[PDB]
Amino acid sequence: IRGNDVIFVLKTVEAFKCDELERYIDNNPECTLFESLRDEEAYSIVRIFMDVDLDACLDEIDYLTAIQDFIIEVSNCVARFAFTECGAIHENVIKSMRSNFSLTKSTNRDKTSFHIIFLDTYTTMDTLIAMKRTLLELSRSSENPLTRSIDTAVYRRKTTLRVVGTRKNPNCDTIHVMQPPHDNIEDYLFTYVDMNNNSYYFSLWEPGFISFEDAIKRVSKIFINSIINFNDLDENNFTTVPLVIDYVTPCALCKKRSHKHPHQLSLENGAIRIYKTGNPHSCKVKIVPLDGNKLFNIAQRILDTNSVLLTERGDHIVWINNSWKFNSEEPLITKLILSIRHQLPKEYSSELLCPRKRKTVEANIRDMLVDSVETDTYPDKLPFKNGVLDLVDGMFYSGDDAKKYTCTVSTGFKFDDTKFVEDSPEMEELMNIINDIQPLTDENKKNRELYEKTLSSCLCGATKGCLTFFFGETATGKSTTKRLLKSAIGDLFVETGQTILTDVLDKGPNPFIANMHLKRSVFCSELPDFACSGSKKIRSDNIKKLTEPCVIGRPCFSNKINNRNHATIIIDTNYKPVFDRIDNALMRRIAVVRFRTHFSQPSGREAAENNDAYDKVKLLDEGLDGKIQNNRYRFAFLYLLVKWYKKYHIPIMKLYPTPEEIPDFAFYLKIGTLLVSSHIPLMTDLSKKGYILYDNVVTLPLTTFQQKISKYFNSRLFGHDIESFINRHKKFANVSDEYLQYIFIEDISSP
Amino acid sequence: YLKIGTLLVSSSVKHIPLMTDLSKKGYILYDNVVTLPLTTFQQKISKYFNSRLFGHDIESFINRHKKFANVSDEYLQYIFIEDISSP
Ligand SMILES: [Zn+2]
């Protein structure tokens, strides 16, 4: 659509532009033109507009407060309707609606009418048609005289709206005068679509009220004083007889001792309006409802601010003090009900001070929350205690903006821009520490890049399909890297023991199984070396099961077993891992990060001078570990992590395994590179080489195979591995021995 | 475990000039480094400390932190303190 600059009008027809309409209006002040839609189907996208009419006069203060509350209520209700039905964003709609709006007026001083248009919000006419019932409920479920007077009509096909500055009728001289700051004729058109940057768009007496006597009693209680002309009002004289009151005490509505004329009660929109006659500003207007609870309307107003949603599992997440809290032990809805009373009208705030009413208006909220939402869906954002830091752009959001993202976890500490710097001595000290841990030589280049990549994945809410191994001799200070990462990433990071590396992953109630829920990094240290006999091999089942994007595990006294998996798993030790089970999936799901830095004191430095444990040796310092424990380089290291993530995270970043540094998998690699599955039309070459083919399957004797492979590989090194491989690929039968099928790649190449 | 390193020394990688001299005392000097036989290393370990109270710990420590100049052979890369120190 890209907006429309043509305004179609009806004289009781034309298609004029902004300048054309302005010139025509200036030429003819008395012309009556109604702005409508030239074609309903073509340009159904229009602005959001409302028309309000209340036949009474109000002063400046009352009008100001009433219009403020009217904007608040209408914007919240429309944003809630957009969120539930049109799939929009609540915060965006609220911001667009409250940012800028055009408000007209009426030249008549005996009544208050206007047409209000929200400039930046645009939606299809079908959406405004569907909003009919919701807006009618809002109109009939409020106390504000402006909100109660909303005309739900004008939401029909091919509707028309009276243009500003033109008389509605030739006989009626009253016209609507524009108000600051718009002052332009294009700012009061409900079809003038002007989509731009700061904008948003979305799309898909009746007896039945109450007994008369109770209404009369309510009116009398409002008047406080007794009615002089009592026992005279009935069904017929409801809006005819004046209400004469004795001025025993000053009027509750006006606070004055007396007035020139009595009051009068009228019926409108299922409510009773009490107003004085003669001078209009002598007494205010009193509104009396005729249906609905008072505790249900409060629940609706608290609900349609989108602050008490429920999760996809069944937990009600509330928004208190700029953070999405939630607890399943002491539910927080009553805290929210108490703390939100300031954003509610005067009559709705005194109710939320009795604890027996903040349980009624809370049962209502729980009964109105049907269907769920999804939490922590955007993985490129880091939730801090006072907001959300964006990673792709680096901009920080605080306050209601962070509400847009259902961040159910947090790092635990606030975000400070002063410490968040680039050129600081702490940054240089951290860079020196990292260089000491990771020398930047060309030999280390690839390993250092893998280090930076696997260390920067901690700022990702997505799931990763690899498990990097920190392999390095002692005194390499991997604990320093662990401490720096913990200080940078807050309480999201978790350190776990080897309990998951040996036992069954799910099995029974495992605390680390549930703790992997939404934690962004899991670290294991000092692995139980399986080189010595007795220690269990690294459970291949657990490693395979930890890679999936889901976690299945239920702790003691619980039933939930589904957890979202975001943690990057890192294992650090000085011993090569040993896994009893081996398959191609394992060979494609293991990465190794090598450490070649020795941090040793001078006393043993000579002992480390010729040591083969590390490719370099340098003096250590006991005064650094405490510094890392004191969150010294926290924000500089966080900046480094952000830079690494930016330089590494392409539109799709993946953890690539490195199956070359693991000594155990080298045997399988050598076997595969020298022997694979056995090619029918190559019998002559096999016969020349000595091998024979029988029953369409080339075979050799088991003793012959052992003799052939004796020289190719060291039998004493991996005799158990060779026996296990033979058992796995065993075939048996045939001739007078077992059957072994393979191709000697080294012999296959040689003719 | 604590006392094993007290009477043990790191591999003398940078002892190429002295590796040849140490080889004549019962080392193979393979891969430009002095390497003693696994049986010889076990005998030296049993001589260093009472073999009655020292059993599988020495073998486990050797398998953890020693090599036989190849993938696996009958040698040991564990450098004796009383031998590797002397050129
Ligand atoms: Zn009054």
Side-chain angles (χ1 to χ4, degrees), chain A residues 3 5 7 9 15 17 21 24-25 27-30 32 34-37 42-44 46-50 52-56 58-59 62-63 65-90 92-99 101-104 106-108 111-125 127-128 130-140 142-150 152-153 155-156 159 161 163-165 167 169-172 174 176-177 179-181 184-192 194-196 199-212 214-215 217-218 220 222-223 225-228 230 235 238-243 245-248 250-252 254 258-259 261-263 266-275 277-281 283 285 287-311 313-320 322-326 328 331-352 354-371 373 375 377-380 382-399 401-405 407-413 415-417 420 422 425 428 432 435-439 441 444 446-447 449-451 453 455-466 468-472 474-477 479-482 485-488 490-494 497 501 508-509 511-512 514-515 517-518 521 523-526 528 531-532 534 543 547-551 553-560 562-563 565-573 575 577 580-583 585-586 590-593 595 602 604 607-608 613 623-624 626 629-631 633-642 644-649 651 653-659 663 665-666 669 672 681 690 701 719 733 751, chain B residues 5 17 26 37 55 69 87:
Chain A
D5 298 296
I7 298 97
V9 303
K17 310 294 183 151
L21 184 62
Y24 183 82
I25 286 183
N27 202 345
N28 214 342
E30 313 206 16
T32 81
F34 276 32
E35 173 184 1
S36 63
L37 281 167
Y43 291 165
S44 180
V46 293
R47 290 180 149 172
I48 279 177
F49 70 104
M50 284 148 190
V52 169
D53 171 23
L54 159 71
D55 270 7
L58 298 179
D59 55 71
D62 295 4
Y63 181 81
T65 177
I67 195 72
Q68 289 161 200
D69 294 6
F70 169 87
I71 299 299
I72 290 185
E73 267 168 15
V74 170
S75 85
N76 276 336
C77 182
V78 175
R80 170 74 177 180
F81 173 85
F83 172 88
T84 299
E85 309 271 336
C86 304
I89 296 90
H90 194 77
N92 264 324
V93 174
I94 289 190
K95 173 175 180 180
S96 170
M97 267 194 154
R98 307 204 205 178
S99 47
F101 62 89
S102 67
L103 178 137
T104 73
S106 164
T107 199
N108 194 353
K111 82 184 187 73
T112 299
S113 162
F114 52 84
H115 317 291
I116 176 171
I117 284 173
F118 295 92
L119 289 166
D120 299 290
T121 316
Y122 306 86
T123 180
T124 76
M125 180 52 79
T127 294
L128 286 171
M131 278 192 198
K132 186 96 170 294
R133 183 212 273 278
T134 293
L135 277 182
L136 193 54
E137 278 175 27
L138 167 57
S139 169
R140 274 146 168 285
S142 78
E143 296 292 328
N144 189 358
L146 277 163
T147 314
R148 159 88 57 179
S149 314
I150 293 180
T152 188
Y155 294 155
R156 45 175 147 71
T159 191
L161 188 152
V163 192
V164 179
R167 300 149 76 85
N169 196 272
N171 278 295
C172 169
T174 65
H176 287 322
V177 285
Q179 291 317 312
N184 319 307
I185 202 67
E186 68 272 26
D187 264 334
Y188 306 89
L189 311 167
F190 85 105
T191 304
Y192 184 76
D194 192 3
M195 197 91 67
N196 64 347
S199 170
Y200 197 83
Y201 170 90
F202 63 98
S203 52
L204 306 103
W205 177 286
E206 181 188 5
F209 305 143
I210 193 174
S211 83
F212 196 107
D214 272 329
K217 287 172 84 81
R218 293 163 169 204
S220 58
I222 295 314
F223 283 107
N225 312 338
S226 188
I227 310 305
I228 304 175
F230 203 70
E235 181 49 47
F238 184 76
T239 67
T240 56
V241 65
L243 277 297
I245 54 171
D246 48 351
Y247 297 129
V248 173
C251 174
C254 63
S258 300
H259 295 296
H261 299 91
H263 295 285
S266 72
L267 190 150
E268 66 180 3
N269 198 353
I272 285 181
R273 202 184 95 263
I274 292 157
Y275 70 103
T277 50
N279 46 2
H281 292 53
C283 282
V285 293
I287 307 294
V288 164
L290 284 186
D291 55 355
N293 276 322
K294 197 183 188 71
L295 277 297
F296 196 86
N297 311 334
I298 302 180
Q300 281 178 336
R301 307 278 91 91
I302 284 166
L303 184 68
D304 76 345
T305 62
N306 263 326
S307 57
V308 71
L309 312 158
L310 73 165
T311 48
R313 98 184 74 191
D315 272 13
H316 299 262
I317 47 174
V318 307
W319 168 265
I320 298 169
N322 297 5
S323 65
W324 280 99
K325 301 186 186 74
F326 85 109
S328 194
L332 303 175
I333 309 193
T334 59
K335 320 207 166 187
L336 186 149
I337 285 168
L338 186 60
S339 66
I340 207 166
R341 73 190 139 94
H342 298 126
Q343 310 161 32
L344 261 62
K346 179 209 318 169
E347 69 275 15
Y348 282 165
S349 294
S350 50
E351 306 287 285
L352 319 172
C354 196
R356 293 162 285 290
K357 280 159 184 168
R358 307 184 322 239
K359 268 173 278 178
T360 290
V361 66
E362 190 267 336
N364 284 312
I365 287 186
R366 291 170 95 113
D367 292 350
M368 299 191 231
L369 290 174
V370 55
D371 82 0
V373 297
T375 44
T377 55
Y378 288 1
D380 68 332
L382 197 48
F384 286 91
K385 191 164 50 195
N386 64 277
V388 175
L389 165 63
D390 191 359
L391 290 198
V392 293
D393 300 337
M395 178 53 55
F396 182 62
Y397 300 145
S398 170
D401 310 335
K403 182 199 229 180
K404 184 157 52 177
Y405 304 103
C407 282
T408 44
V409 295
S410 67
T411 52
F413 46 77
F415 185 97
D416 180 72
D417 199 7
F420 200 95
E422 184 154 17
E428 296 313 312
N432 291 127
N435 289 133
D436 298 323
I437 299 275
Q438 177 62 78
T441 179
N444 283 114
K446 199 65 58 164
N447 180 80
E449 297 310 320
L450 266 293
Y451 173 53
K453 187 167 177 180
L455 211 58
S456 190
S457 69
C458 288
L459 312 187
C460 279
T463 177
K464 291 304 158 155
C466 189
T468 44
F469 270 97
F470 285 167
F471 191 81
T474 57
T476 195
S479 297
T480 298
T481 286
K482 173 259 167 192
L485 181 82
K486 173 154 196 300
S487 49
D491 50 8
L492 305 174
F493 166 67
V494 70
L501 291 186
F512 312 110
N515 275 345
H517 189 55
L518 270 48
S521 179
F523 203 88
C524 283
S525 50
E526 280 284 322
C532 55
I543 302 300
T547 314
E548 278 71 16
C550 167
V551 167
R554 48 187 186 103
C556 288
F557 312 96
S558 168
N559 198 278
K560 197 65 55 196
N562 193 353
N563 315 324
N565 175 271
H566 312 327
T568 286
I569 300 197
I570 299 180
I571 295 169
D572 175 46
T573 187
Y575 311 97
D580 51 353
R581 300 190 69 82
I582 298 94
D583 44 34
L586 273 156
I590 287 295
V592 179
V593 175
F595 288 166
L624 181 53
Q629 216 278 335
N630 299 321
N631 52 69
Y633 320 98
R634 146 178 296 168
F635 292 96
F637 191 67
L638 196 153
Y639 199 118
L640 163 75
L641 285 150
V642 175
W644 272 343
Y645 166 84
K646 166 68 174 62
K647 77 169 301 304
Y648 277 135
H649 191 203
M653 80 184 284
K654 74 191 184 82
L655 284 189
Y656 192 46
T658 72
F665 291 175
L669 294 174

